[model samples]
Target chain A: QTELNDFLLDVSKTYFDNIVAIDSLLEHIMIYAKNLVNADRCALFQVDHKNKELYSDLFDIGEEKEGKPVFKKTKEIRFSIEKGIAGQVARTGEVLNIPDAYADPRFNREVDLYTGYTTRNILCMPIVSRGSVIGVVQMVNKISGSAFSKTDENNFKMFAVFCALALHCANMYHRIR
Target chain B: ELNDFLLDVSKTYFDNIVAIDSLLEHIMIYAKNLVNADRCALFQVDHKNKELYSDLFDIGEEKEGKPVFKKTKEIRFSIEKGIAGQVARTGEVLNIPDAYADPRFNREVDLYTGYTTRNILCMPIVSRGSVIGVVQMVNKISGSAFSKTDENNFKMFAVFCALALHCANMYH
Candidate 1:
């Protein structure tokens, strides 16, 4: 409970107190999630509803190559409504907590190969707003000494809710402004 | 990726800045919306003294009628410290999520002006691996955090501005 409370407090502090611009909001999301989950890296993928593609936007806490974080367009990796972690979460609008990514068959190792980083523990949840899946927030590879805990899973769920609301507002603002 | 938007902005900046004889005016207007910043400035780095000598965008009343820039005679930064010095020293981009919270933030200028600092995106303008100058934008308009897209845009714009500054220096 204390850990959960601390996670919530940190999320609120980073998201509400410091977030001032759209870019900052996205950075805060990945940074806070990484810190909260004790993960080495975090990334946010926006779901292109029409094309059913995952659009990569922000990748935090990773080494930058030539002044840019390494990113790839992964539209080729398809996920059906009834399969995989991201697919299951997106279709059901629920959270998927995987203790070890290697044990999960749905884990996409392409990103790991591209970045030369291994994926161990993963906690991914869909960014559901108004009953629709807008995107997915994922945290990977808990820091060297720590492992993803049940408390982390719970905190990540709360963070996902906040992410959904914040993203919804940002989308609305972007469309209207 | 916001790459297209930045490319267009860079093109506009190159065209406008070259059109205007005053390089300072061109930098201010060109970089304002690129970061959605309230203000943007180009500072010429003095490597020997490790200080910012001239500011290309000082359009406010604080320094009105006086020199629109500062001298490094009194104010000096270690070549390894602060955002300005980090860019000056390493030729890398320094993106601070929160300026006040960052220990490397140099508060002397903001303190002197009584302006509260927020997010700062600073990048070194380098040519052939040597830093020619630095361009910085501060205080996003929407009061939100800066994303990687903003950093990329700033970096691309910095590359273009660095070329323009290099050309301007050669002509002078």
Candidate 2:
């Protein structure tokens, strides 16, 4: 119990420390969230209220090169809020912990095919700020080779708060910049 | 339970985030409280000019419930001068238990600001493998020298400052 503080504080520090642009800060959020829950990969889809869609410009960005990590280089992709598992969570603001993603009807296989990454289990949660679902976080395939547990869901509940706050600040900061 | 409180303090910065002084002042408030210091100031490095400068210097005492800030005239000097310059130049953490006793400590700034100096804990804010800036915490409020724990925890906060300052540089 005592040793847990170091790991938890370190995890919290990653979120608090990254107050960069939306894309850069989300990169830190996704990475920290994925590792916090021991997931294989993670992605964030922001809710675009004006366009009535979910979008992410920083999707599965690859490794760094030339002494700089590439950013804003990935093409922005969008999907209507009425579409997939992420959409369902965004619409309802509910935590979705699916033991088997392929078995779930709402699971979209096109992503697995495009990225060439096999999907098994998923834990998707909404990033809500001020009572509105501002974004959704989808963590795929727990590295533990098993389904995400109740503990993972509980931990994610806390991480989502920081995510919402960081995203909100990043957006506001971006506008004025 | 104590850790929860510390993390909550970290999240408080996002409450009213802005581009420049708003964010620096927020950082100063947290840094002051994180280790219970009497004053906290941040200095940005001028690499091309080999200088350290600050536009928003020390944070003043709290009034009513909000921390008071002083936007002083820009203080700039060579990167070869005081304790801050030493930390910035060498990328090291200097926890001087006595400010006036150290040869590296400079008293001119205190003369200008009319503040008495006691202990100091300064750390570099490094980004992309370069020292971007430094955070200086003056006079522990506890009437004691900064401990090893203070240095370790303050190092984590400095990392956050580095990221925010990095984004600030990009904004400029």
Candidate 3:
């Protein structure tokens, strides 16, 4: 198992060193983080607290599933912050780790039902920057066909921190420009 | 075959001098059809001369007093100049949701013309990896919001326009 603290420190260094535009930086982070986690699907959703919606800007994992690449640009899906695992995390500004998402009542099965994919496990973490929950980081279906371990959760927790900082910087850059 | 067809059509479009102005006019017409945009303009960046010049526009006759329509013989923009210049320098697409609210937006053009810019889709035209010009569509006709699909379509058109502009320059 890789040292979670060491991985976090390395990612933090890379995130700060590369000061490219927001979209480009997010692409880099997605590609790198996906490979690190060894997950099949990774998505970054920007939270709209006022409207209670999550906007997906970049989504990609493996080959094309169904008719699409399992990714749609500028797609938005609404989820009440008061419901579901992601919503609870966003509302409370806390992290929720579900070893088996299928067993959790807070796990909204609508996405899986719509996509016709079975949900085995999920690690949904809130991306809090500047003391506010700006977004959510979700990794679904570990590539190994097994439950996500504590090591996996720890590694993802660290990755979430880097994501938070990157998102904050990107937001600031947009504001300044 | 599609690429060849596109090339052939482009060749023919540039082959006739009388077709250039009409072609750009038709381009704006197609743009209006594709989106709810009422006004659109094409611009070319002369890096050597450091200026942004309009090639054509679709602003009505009555609105010709608008600064964007003014036939300035040559409008020079420093490399570090306004939004257009900055986009040219950076080689990036910019979608301003609200042009008037953006600080980078220069109101001088609007003030001179008495036109209100509600929204803008500005994209760089790159040929052989170099930004040759910019094409922008402003103020939707329907007053409905411009979506990401509009920006993506504009980007696709900009690529082809870049090639078309290169041919125009070569033939001229």
Query: Model 3: residues >4 Å from true position, as ranges?
Result: A1-177, B1-15, B62-76
Superposed Cα deviation of residue A72, candidate 3 (Å): 30
C-alpha lDDT of residue A147 in model 2: 91
lDDT of 1 by residue, B1-172 (tens): 1222212222222243343233334345445654677656677766676666444654342443222333223444456656777778787778788987988888876866677778888888775567867777888888675666567545533534654565555545
Give the candidate order by descending TM-score.
2, 3, 1
Question: How do the residues B1-172 of candidate 2 rate in per-residue lDDT, one tens digit apiece?
Answer: 2223223323323333344455566566666776788887788888999998875566576665657776653778889988999999999889999889999987777886789989989998887678989888889987688886676556645645765676677666
lDDT of 3 by residue, B13-101 (tens): 22344444434443454455455676777778877877777666545554333223333424444546556666778887788778878
Top candidate on TM-score is: 2
Work out the iRMS of candidate 2. Answer: 8.5
Q: Is candidate 1 or candidate 3 better by TM-score?
A: 3
DockQ of each: 0.01, 0.03, 0.01
Model 2 lDDT per residue over A1-103, tens place? 3333454355445545654544544555566566667876667778998988888645554454583334333436677888778888878776778889888
True contacts kept of each: 0.00, 0.00, 0.00
- What residue pairs clash in candidate 2, if any at all? none
User: Which stretches of model 2 miss by more than 4 angstroms?
Assistant: A1-177, B1-18, B59-64
TM-score of each: 0.40, 0.52, 0.43
A21 Cα displacement, candidate 3 (Å): 33
Give per-residue lDDT, candidate 1, residue B103. Answer: 87
